[PDB]
Amino acid sequence: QVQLQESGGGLVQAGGSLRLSCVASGRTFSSYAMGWFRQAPGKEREFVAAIDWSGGTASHADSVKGRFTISRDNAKNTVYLQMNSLKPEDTAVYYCAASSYWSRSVDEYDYWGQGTQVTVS
Amino acid sequence: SDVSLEEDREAVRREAERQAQAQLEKAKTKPVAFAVRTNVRYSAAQEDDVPVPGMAISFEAKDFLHVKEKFNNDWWIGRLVKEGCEIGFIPSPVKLENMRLQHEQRAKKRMPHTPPYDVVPSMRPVVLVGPSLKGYEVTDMMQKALFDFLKHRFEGRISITRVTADISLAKRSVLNNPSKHAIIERSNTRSSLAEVQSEIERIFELARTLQLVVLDADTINHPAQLSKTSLAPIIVYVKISSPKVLQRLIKSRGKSQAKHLNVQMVAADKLAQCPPQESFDVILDENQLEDACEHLADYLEAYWKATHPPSSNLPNPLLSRT
Ligand SMILES: [Ca+2]
Ligand SMILES: [Mg+2]
C-alpha cells in the first residue's frame, strides 16, 4: 500500500538473470494492480510491466517482451520482475508502483516505491 | 446562520457532483481502455458516496464492464457490457473492499478475500469446440465451414487469428507460479511459457479496438481448458448429439480417420458430460449448416450491439444563452 520497498539488485554487463522484488505494507495488496517502471539517467519514466489484482493477466512493454516477466505473490505482498538478456538500453532506475486502476501511465498510479538502480554495459 | 451554513455544505456537494458529471460527459467520447469480468455482485447502496449519486453501475457476478477512465482511487468511469446500459461510476477494488467491511460491521461465529475484478480482453474471443477433436477431418471440416461463414457475415468487423500455442497454460498456476521452479524457468529466454504469454498479450491487443475476435485455437477442445484463464472466451459448442451419427461421419472419412475413432468418440462424450449452462455460451445442434450459422450470427450480432452502444445525443447549442 503506502510503503513499497524494492529489493532488486545492482548492475551487470550483459546477459544476466536478476529477480527484482518489491514488498508492500498493509493487507490491501490484493486491491492494487502492480507495475514496474524505469527511468534512464537522462530519460523519462517508461512503463515496463504490469500485473492485475489476482495475477491472472500481465502486460509487458514492447521493448521488453520475452526478456522480462512480472509476477506477484499475494500471500507475501511481493511483486517481481525477472529480467533476462540485459542490454545497455536497460540502464535505468527501476520503480515499482501500485494502482487502483489498470494502466501503464505514470499519472494513474497511486503509490510509488523508492527505486533500484540497474546498469548494463 | 447555522442553516445558511448547511446550505453551503450542500452547495459544495452539488458543485462536486456537477464537476463529476461534467467529467462523465467528457468520457462518453473516449475509447474503451480495458475490460474486466466481475467475481462478485455489487448492488449500489445509498451510503456508497458515488461521485454523482444514482449513477453507480450495479453488476452481478461474472458480468463484463467496459472501462473508459479512472475518476479517482475509489471510482472508475465505464459501463456494463449489455444493451441499453450507459456509462456511470464503477467502484474500484479499493472502494469495493471498504464497502464490504462496512457491511460486515453492521451485520448481526466464534472466530469473528477474492479479488472482484479480472482484466479480460475488451471483446470476448470466440472459440469453437466440438463435435470432436481438432486435427481430424470431421471436426476440422465443420469448424472450417463456420469460420468461412464468419469471415463473410462479419467482414470489416471481424479479426480471425490462428493460435497454435497451448493457451490452456495461461493460468495463474502456471504463468504466475511463485515456486522456485518458475523463478528458474523465467531465467531461460527459451522457456515455452514465453510464447504462451506473448500469444495472450496479442489476443488482448487484437480486441482493444472492439472488433469481433475469433480464435482458431488448436489446443482447445473443451471449455475446462480455458475456464482458468483470463481470456473469458465465448465458447461455441459445435455439437453432434447422436454418438452413432458421429461414428458414421468419422467412418465415412476413410480408414485414416477411422483408426483414431475411439479418441474422437471419447472427446465428444466429454463435451456431452459438461453441464451446458456453465460450460457453453452458444450450443449449435441444428440439423442444417445454414441454421447453425444463423444461430451463431444472431448471437454475435447481439454481442456486437452490447459492445457498440449508440452515441449519446449532444446537448443542442441553441438552448444556450451565450
Ligand atoms: Ca448432420
Ligand atoms: Mg447510483
Numbering used by the authors:
A (entry chain B): 2 to 122
B (entry chain A): 29 to 136, 206 to 209, 216 to 425
Excerpt from the publication:
High-voltage activated calcium channels (HVACCs) convert information encoded in electrical signals to Ca2+ influx into cells to drive important biological responses including synaptic transmission in neurons and muscle contraction in the heart. Mature HVACCs are multi-subunit complexes comprised of pore-forming α1 polypeptides assembled with auxiliary β, α2δ, and γ subunits. There are four CaVβ subunits isoforms (CaVβ1 - CaVβ4) encoded by distinct genes. Beyond surface density, CaVβs also regulate different aspects of channel gating including open probability (Po), voltage-dependence of activation and inactivation, and inactivation kinetics.
To understand the differential nanobody recognition modes, we crystalized CaVβ complexes containing the non-selective nanobody nb.F3 and the CaVβ1b-selective nanobody nb.E8 with two target CaVβs, CaVβ2a34 and CaVβ1b, and determined their structures using X-ray crystallography. CaVβ2a was crystallized as a 1:1 complex with nb.F3, whereas CaVβ1b was crystallized as a 1:1:1 complex with nb.F3 and nb.E8. The nb.F3:CaVβ2a complex showed that nb.F3 engages CaVβ2a using two interaction sites encompassing ~forty nb.F3 residues. Site 1 comprises interactions with the three complementarity determining regions (CDRs) CDR1, CDR2 and CDR3, the majority of which are made between nb.F3 CDR3 with Phe62, Lys98, Asn 101, and Trp104 from β1, β2, and β3 of the SH3 core and CDR2 with Tyr200, Asp221, and Val222 from the SH3 β5 strand contributed from the NK domain. Structural comparison shows that CDR3 Tyr102-Trp103 and the RMPF peptide make remarkably similar interactions even though their peptide chains run in opposite directions. Most of residues in Site 1 and Site 2 are highly conserved amongst different CaVβs, explaining the relative lack of specificity for nb.F3.
